[PDB]
């Protein structure tokens, strides 16, 4: 599941730069009012460097 993918860090993950998926993830990862924290982990992985 995406939750389990967000807990682990042994396998890195990413997407195509600036694609609609990248904006969609960044929209959630920064949001402090989101009910589900998962995306804050997904964003914290994708955004490195």
């Amino acid at each position: 599941s995406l939750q389990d993918l967000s807990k682990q860090t042994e396998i890195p993950y990413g997407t195509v730069l600036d694609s609609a998926v990248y904006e969609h993830v960044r929209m959630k990862g920064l949001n402090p009012f989101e009910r589900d924290s998962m995306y804050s982990q997904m964003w914290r992985m994708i955004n490195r460097s």
């Binding site: 402090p32 009012f33 989101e34």
Partner: protein, 98 residues
């Protein structure tokens, strides 16, 4: 596209009665607007900003308003206590039902 010299008498007559009116302008790219806020403000401030959205007035054409409301609701910046006023001169019954 709005010419703010319309509300120029409303802000005047309101600011004598002690209300904390704020302006803002709605961008063409509403997603880049909202994502600028979470990227450029403290959590100390976002919780003050949410308290202002409790009451708001939207002065725009319906096709923009539908899109803005849908995004503000999907981003959970408002909840069941909010009370927004929408004002315009031309809205047909097909749009009210959306």
């Amino acid at each position: 596209e709005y010419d703010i010299r319309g509300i120029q008498e409303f802000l005047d007559k309101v600011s004598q009665q002690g209300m904390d009116v704020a302006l803002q302008k709605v961008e063409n790219n509403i997603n880049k607007m909202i994502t600028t806020l979470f990227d450029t403000m403290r959590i100390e401030e976002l919780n003050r900003y949410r308290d202002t959205l409790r009451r708001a007035i939207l002065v725009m054409n319906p096709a923009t308003a539908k899109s803005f409301i849908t995004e503000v609701v999907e981003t959970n910046l408002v909840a069941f206590d909010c009370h927004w006023i929408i004002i315009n001169e031309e809205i047909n019954d097909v749009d009210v039902q959306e």
